[PDB]
Amino acid sequence: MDESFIGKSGGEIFHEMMLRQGVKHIFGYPGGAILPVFDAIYNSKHFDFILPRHEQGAGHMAEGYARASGKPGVVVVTSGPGATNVITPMQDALSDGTPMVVFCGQVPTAAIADVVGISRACTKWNVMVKSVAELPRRINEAFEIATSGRPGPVLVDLPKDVTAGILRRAIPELSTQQLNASIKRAADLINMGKKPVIYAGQGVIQSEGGPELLKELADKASIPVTTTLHGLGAFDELDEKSLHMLGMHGAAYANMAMQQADVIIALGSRFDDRVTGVVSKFAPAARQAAAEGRGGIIHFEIMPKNINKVVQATEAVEGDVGANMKLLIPQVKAKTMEDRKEWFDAIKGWKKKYPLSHYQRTGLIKPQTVMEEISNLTADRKDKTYIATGVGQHQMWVAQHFRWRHPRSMITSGGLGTMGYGLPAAIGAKVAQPDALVIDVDGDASFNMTLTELSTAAQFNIGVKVVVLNNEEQGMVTQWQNLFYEDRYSHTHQRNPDFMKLADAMGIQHQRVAEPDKLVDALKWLINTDGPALLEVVTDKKVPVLPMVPAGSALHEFLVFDPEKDKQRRELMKERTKGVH
Amino acid sequence: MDESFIGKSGGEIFHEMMLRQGVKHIFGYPGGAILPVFDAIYNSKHFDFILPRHEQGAGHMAEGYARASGKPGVVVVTSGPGATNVITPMQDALSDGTPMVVFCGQVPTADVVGISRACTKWNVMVKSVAELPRRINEAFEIATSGRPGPVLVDLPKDVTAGILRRAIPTPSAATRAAKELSTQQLNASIKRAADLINMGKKPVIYAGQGVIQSEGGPELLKELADKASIPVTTTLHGLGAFDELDEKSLHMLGMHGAAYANMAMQQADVIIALGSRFDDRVTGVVSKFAPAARQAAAEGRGGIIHFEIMPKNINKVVQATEAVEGDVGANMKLLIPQVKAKTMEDRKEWFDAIKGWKKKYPLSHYQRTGLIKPQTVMEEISNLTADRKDKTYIATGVGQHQMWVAQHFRWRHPRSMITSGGLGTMGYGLPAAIGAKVAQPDALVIDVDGDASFNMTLTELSTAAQFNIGVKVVVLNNEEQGMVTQWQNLFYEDRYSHTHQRNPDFMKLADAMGIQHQRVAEPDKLVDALKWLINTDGPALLEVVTDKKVPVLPMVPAGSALHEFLVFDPEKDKQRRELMKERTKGVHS
Numbered sequence A: 001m002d003e004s005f006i007g008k009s010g011g012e013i014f015h016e017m018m019l020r021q022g023v024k025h026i027f028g029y030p031g032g033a034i035l036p037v038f039d040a041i042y043n044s045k046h047f048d049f050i051l052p053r054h055e056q057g058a059g060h061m062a063e064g065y066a067r068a069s070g071k072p073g074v075v076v077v078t079s080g081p082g083a084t085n086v087i088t089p090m091q092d093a094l095s096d097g098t099p100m101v102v103f104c105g106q107v108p109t110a111a112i113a114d115v116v117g118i119s120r121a122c123t124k125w126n127v128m129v130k131s132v133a134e135l136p137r138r139i140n141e142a143f144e145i146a147t148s149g150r151p152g153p154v155l156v157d158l159p160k161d162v163t164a165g166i167l168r169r170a171i172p173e174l175s176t177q178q179l180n181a182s183i184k185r186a187a188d189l190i191n192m193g194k195k196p197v198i199y200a201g202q203g204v205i206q207s208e209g210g211p212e213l214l215k216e217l218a219d220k221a222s223i224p225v226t227t228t229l230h231g232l233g234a235f236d237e238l239d240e241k242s243l244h245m246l247g248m249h250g251a252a253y254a255n256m257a258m259q260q261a262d263v264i265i266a267l268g269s270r271f272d273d274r275v276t277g278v279v280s281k282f283a284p285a286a287r288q289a290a291a292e293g294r295g296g297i298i299h300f301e302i303m304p305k306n307i308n309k310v311v312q313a314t315e316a317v318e319g320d321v322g323a324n325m326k327l328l329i330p331q332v333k334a335k336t337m338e339d340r341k342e343w344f345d346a347i348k349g350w351k352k353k354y355p356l357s358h359y360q361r362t363g364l365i366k367p368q369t370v371m372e373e374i375s376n377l378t379a380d381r382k383d384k385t386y387i388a389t390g391v392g393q394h395q396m397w398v399a400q401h402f403r404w405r406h407p408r409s410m411i412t413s414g415g416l417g418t419m420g421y422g423l424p425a426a427i428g429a430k431v432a433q434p435d436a437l438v439i440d441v442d443g444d445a446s447f448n449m450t451l452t453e454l455s456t457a458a459q460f461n462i463g464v465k466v467v468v469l470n471n472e473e474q475g476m477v478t479q480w481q482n483l484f485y486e487d488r489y490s491h492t493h494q495r496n497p498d499f500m501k502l503a504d505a506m507g508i509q510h511q512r513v514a515e516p517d518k519l520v521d522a523l524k525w526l527i528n529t530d531g532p533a534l535l536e537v538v539t540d541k542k543v544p545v546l547p548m549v550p551a552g553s554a555l556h557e558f559l560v561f562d563p564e565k566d567k568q569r570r571e572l573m574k575e576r577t578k579g580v581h
Numbered sequence B: 001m002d003e004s005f006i007g008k009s010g011g012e013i014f015h016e017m018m019l020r021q022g023v024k025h026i027f028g029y030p031g032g033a034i035l036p037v038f039d040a041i042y043n044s045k046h047f048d049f050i051l052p053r054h055e056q057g058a059g060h061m062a063e064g065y066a067r068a069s070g071k072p073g074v075v076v077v078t079s080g081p082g083a084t085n086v087i088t089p090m091q092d093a094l095s096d097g098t099p100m101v102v103f104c105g106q107v108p109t110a111d112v113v114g115i116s117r118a119c120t121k122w123n124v125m126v127k128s129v130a131e132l133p134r135r136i137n138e139a140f141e142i143a144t145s146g147r148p149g150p151v152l153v154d155l156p157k158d159v160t161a162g163i164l165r166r167a168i169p170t171p172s173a174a175t176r177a178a179k180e181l182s183t184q185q186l187n188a189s190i191k192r193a194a195d196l197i198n199m200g201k202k203p204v205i206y207a208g209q210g211v212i213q214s215e216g217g218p219e220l221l222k223e224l225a226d227k228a229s230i231p232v233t234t235t236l237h238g239l240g241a242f243d244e245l246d247e248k249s250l251h252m253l254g255m256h257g258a259a260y261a262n263m264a265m266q267q268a269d270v271i272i273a274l275g276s277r278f279d280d281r282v283t284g285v286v287s288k289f290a291p292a293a294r295q296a297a298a299e300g301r302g303g304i305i306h307f308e309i310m311p312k313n314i315n316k317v318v319q320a321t322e323a324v325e326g327d328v329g330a331n332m333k334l335l336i337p338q339v340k341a342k343t344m345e346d347r348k349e350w351f352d353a354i355k356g357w358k359k360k361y362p363l364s365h366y367q368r369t370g371l372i373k374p375q376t377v378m379e380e381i382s383n384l385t386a387d388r389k390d391k392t393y394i395a396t397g398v399g400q401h402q403m404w405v406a407q408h409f410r411w412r413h414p415r416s417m418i419t420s421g422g423l424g425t426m427g428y429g430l431p432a433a434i435g436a437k438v439a440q441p442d443a444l445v446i447d448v449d450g451d452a453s454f455n456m457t458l459t460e461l462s463t464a465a466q467f468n469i470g471v472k473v474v475v476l477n478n479e480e481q482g483m484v485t486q487w488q489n490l491f492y493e494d495r496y497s498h499t500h501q502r503n504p505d506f507m508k509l510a511d512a513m514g515i516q517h518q519r520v521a522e523p524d525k526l527v528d529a530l531k532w533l534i535n536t537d538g539p540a541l542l543e544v545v546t547d548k549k550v551p552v553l554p555m556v557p558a559g560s561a562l563h564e565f566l567v568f569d570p571e572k573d574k575q576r577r578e579l580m581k582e583r584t585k586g587v588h589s
């Protein structure tokens, strides 16, 4: 029975609970209904408060802070438009399993925007706090739900009269057996397999000790490892067993491995549609091996309702992937590269047949090169380097041509795919990792969505580095329009603002590079700059992201780059567009 | 039976439905789920398409288009984040009754219709190509009828990529008897309303956005007020429904309304509420609202007459002595012949009390040094547009500047006020102005914007530049969230928690965006800068550096009754600034 809250207001109690929860940073924006909380946190020493230009920036900043730190991002906003503005961040956090706690002012309880109802389908949980006494309880509930199981966003409603009111009174197995049985069935299934593969996702990064255990099992039994977009960095991409990223824009060899493997080991990962291609043509070899009782698909998942949602698991290992790997690594029998000479020989053949470094290459900077060079210039510091991206081609290229070695280095919007996520998430990651190098690799359209937040980085002296790729197009959509609609480019081009005058207007140091010789010096300038800075890279237009497995394709039915296709495509487009492209 | 669509994709059907609906402009942003619609409208000649920087911008531009033109704003976005980014404009449109049809791409059959159910007037997911024309027509009909509002239409990719291969489809006595009976009830309630007015000795008209949204509404309002010599006050959204230069104008009422409007409302024996919903920021403390009118109802000599199109909305906030259901313009046509004419001389007592209040509490009485006063910016914009009020549209952000333009611009033209009132979304003004300018290409459209409001959506300046949409922007630069610092002064003893921001350089920003620009800080140069802005061609921005910590007055604070307002007092203002300077140790003067 607690009594250290009598005589304090709900805002003052809320201030105490942030301390008890270890909240060191809060992102938010005031308004009428949330004003009692802003009075309580006035000139606080418990945490730093970041005031953005827009609540959507507050929301994405909290996401990047969580992605970089594994701590929950915390947001405080007012009722009405304050809350509706954080819906895209919340839905985004929900889609990508990012822990977030969002507090909203509400009108007084007596007087009934339906913030709670509007947000049911876009949060992991939400609650309206109906009395000042409930306040420590709900706040604790909210923080644990947001971080338990699959982490997610939680919305807490703060009625003004609750936060302004004053507290007067004092306020308050045999499944394990079947788990071990499932672990044993999986080890048998791994050992039995001759063509195994690890398919690792963000669940590994979000489990304590996860990447290390990933390394162990993959080393001991010499199993090749591929990851999703969110799994990037859960395994050293320089390791010889690395297959890199699979899926819609994965490496053609990672796609080959998955399509021909007979034992697939799914760690984290929810088998998203941008990973599997058409699901009835996905993992044929592992599916036959399931039917021939000689292999299949193993799926380590912490959420019961996520299992067999998309693909049927041969054996399902329910619970924390890190803990369950500690009971599976024993029961797996070691192997060597020599053991799987035949398997790795096909893998290594695929790597030479389809290298990620085989893309058209002078005069106009190539966007893949920018990612190669950012990778090169930071190779000596990848344990202290974080990348935030927008959404589009640039997002895929940096997945492809950047070598991920550090877990949580990839800060990107995957499930929802929110353009504009990049810059705010970078700002939040750099608040989380002040002594790290945080780069926002951004396409100009994604960047045009939220570029008002440069002012947040200037006002607070947050040293993010921004690379804007300037191709004057919605690149990902032009690709699709070239592919499926014969170069009819419908509303996919924008006039950019002068990014150099813009960075100047915002109080951000800046340079612009357009000549491929000077590209590396420019990038070197950006990294070694002190305080926030922006580099504008003028790139080539109409550059496809390959490999791509398009809509309706199996996963092995990917397209890849051939210089005769690239010559032919651009000249068909030059004629269709009548010289404009 | 309609065969014209055989062989058409869902996208091409959509394209044709826009033509049949007479849509002339669409605001949107492509994505994967919606690509078949974009392929079908590629280089269309039937409407202009505005690509914004952010889908929130597309929505607010559609709002401003609708607000300036009375036509629905049409939005087209993709699934997931394309759809969640328009939730703020949709909730905004719902709260303010703005007709809007939002088309969202959807993956083949975010939870767009789940997350948007509570923030739309109606939503529908089209399930097959065959039903697309029927649903399109349903959406426009719902969006524009009754109280207008936003309607969300989910468009699954299989519906818009799919092909239609087949044709599709295009009064009793009991009904007739019931029809006559309901007409007689309406006519009865109109007579009673008329009788109530005729016995009133201190009548007042309380006019809202419903009058602007009704065909003939402002004309009929003027005829009524003229014939019976009734003074007219309006809400924030009703500004421009009545000529504020007429001797019968009480200007805006409510939390920041003219003191003479709030007095008149509190003394009136008959209140004629026309197309208004008695919002809490209008009535003050409801139980203390309109005491004179409530007493006159008790004694059978007056009360509150409410003209309202949504029958359900009557008696939800204030008890009506006489309700008149339906479209306020149609019912005023029937009301006016039954109201007996009165001269201003017949109402000498009433207008003399009002002239008293107007003399005692003039809106022009505010602190008037070397820093530009924000109130004075508004008065000068009103003076400088004296000859073109019929072609001038004002969009605003949310905050003090929004109250000041409501108070000191003299409103004369229906739909000239374009502002977010119900939800109160900061960032509305600039996109809404762009939308209004698209709707009225030959009108003067001005975005009067606070700096924090402007900072939310300033990226949309690139939209005005790319499409050469000549909006005029006035940014009031006080470096504060002025409305919140007024609340923090009032209730939290000058504890200014997180309500100050460093702006960007607005001249460098405007230049970066390709917008001609100017900055003004000296009171002697304000008029010429405003003259410069108003006479430019193409988009233009004027930054006005203003005084700080200026309270909006008059003010009915929370928990006070409508007649319990605070007014400007030069000595109280001096004490306030003195105490603020002490507590902030000279930081805020």
Ligand SMILES: Cc1cc2nc3c(=O)[nH]c(=O)nc-3n(C[C@H](O)[C@H](O)[C@H](O)COP(=O)(O)OP(=O)(O)OC[C@H]3O[C@@H](n4cnc5c(N)ncnc54)[C@H](O)[C@@H]3O)c2cc1C
Residues within 6 Å of the ligand: A095, A096, A097, A149, A150, A151, A200, A201, A202, A203, A204, A206, A207, A208, A227, A228, A229, A230, A231, A245, A246, A247, A248, A249, A250, A267, A268, A269, A270, A271, A272, A274, A275, A300, A301, A302, A303, A306, A319, A320, A321, A322, A391, A392, A396, A413, A414, A415, A416, A417
């Ligand atoms: C334009 C675009 C292109 C894309 N291209 C690709 C592509 O080519 N390839 C690709 O892979 N992705 C791609 N993505 C991203 C893709 O859509 C998904 O967001 C992503 O693949 C899913 O990542 P994940 O399954 O690893 O992690 P999540 O989606 O976060 O799910 C991880 C799973 O692990 C579980 N989990 C979490 N914590 C634990 C724990 N401690 N123990 C056990 N389980 C746990 C969760 O419940 C969840 O089911 C693209 C996105 C966009 C917008």
Ligand SMILES: Cc1cc2nc3c(=O)[nH]c(=O)nc-3n(C[C@H](O)[C@H](O)[C@H](O)COP(=O)(O)OP(=O)(O)OC[C@H]3O[C@@H](n4cnc5c(N)ncnc54)[C@H](O)[C@@H]3O)c2cc1C
Residues within 6 Å of the ligand: B095, B096, B097, B146, B147, B148, B207, B208, B209, B210, B211, B213, B214, B215, B234, B235, B236, B237, B238, B252, B253, B254, B255, B256, B257, B274, B275, B276, B277, B278, B279, B281, B282, B307, B308, B309, B310, B313, B326, B327, B328, B329, B398, B399, B420, B421, B422, B423, B424
């Ligand atoms: C900080 C702030 C301060 C504010 N201060 C004030 C203030 O001092 N004073 C003020 O007035 N507002 C103020 N507002 C705005 C206020 O919150 C409301 O948005 C506004 O008062 C509502 O105006 P309305 O009733 O005219 O319009 P609406 O909210 O649109 O209501 C119109 C009503 O008319 C009905 N209607 C529509 N069409 C018709 C028709 N054809 N026939 C009949 N009925 C119809 C609708 O159903 C509805 O009931 C403020 C807002 C903010 C954010």
Ligand SMILES: Cc1ncc(Cn2c(C)c(CCOP(=O)(O)OP(=O)(O)O)sc2=O)c(N)n1
Residues within 6 Å of the ligand: A390, A391, A392, A393, A394, A395, A417, A418, A419, A420, A442, A443, A444, A445, A446, A447, A471, A473, A474, A475, A476, A477, B029, B030, B031, B032, B055, B078, B081, B082, B085
């Ligand atoms: C908020 C929002 N709106 C629309 C989309 C649809 N969309 C769009 C318009 C893409 C093109 C991104 O353009 P960019 O300039 O940011 O990057 P690239 O040129 O590298 O593709 S990618 C994509 O998914 C989206 N993901 N998010």
Ligand SMILES: Cc1ncc(Cn2c(C)c(CCOP(=O)(O)OP(=O)(O)O)sc2=O)c(N)n1
Residues within 6 Å of the ligand: A029, A030, A031, A032, A055, A078, A081, A082, A085, B397, B398, B399, B400, B401, B402, B423, B424, B425, B426, B427, B449, B450, B451, B452, B453, B454, B476, B478, B480, B481, B482, B483, B484
């Ligand atoms: C999107 C959003 N966030 C927060 C608020 C809360 N709020 C805030 C923060 C106001 C201050 C706006 O400051 P401004 O610079 O735009 O204008 P003034 O300085 O003239 O008040 S007014 C108001 O209602 C809001 N209405 N909308």
Ligand SMILES: [Mg+2]
Residues within 6 Å of the ligand: A443, A444, A445, A469, A470, A471, A472, A473, A474, A475
């Ligand atoms: Mg681009």
Ligand SMILES: [Mg+2]
Residues within 6 Å of the ligand: B450, B451, B452, B476, B477, B478, B479, B480, B481, B482
């Ligand atoms: Mg301001």
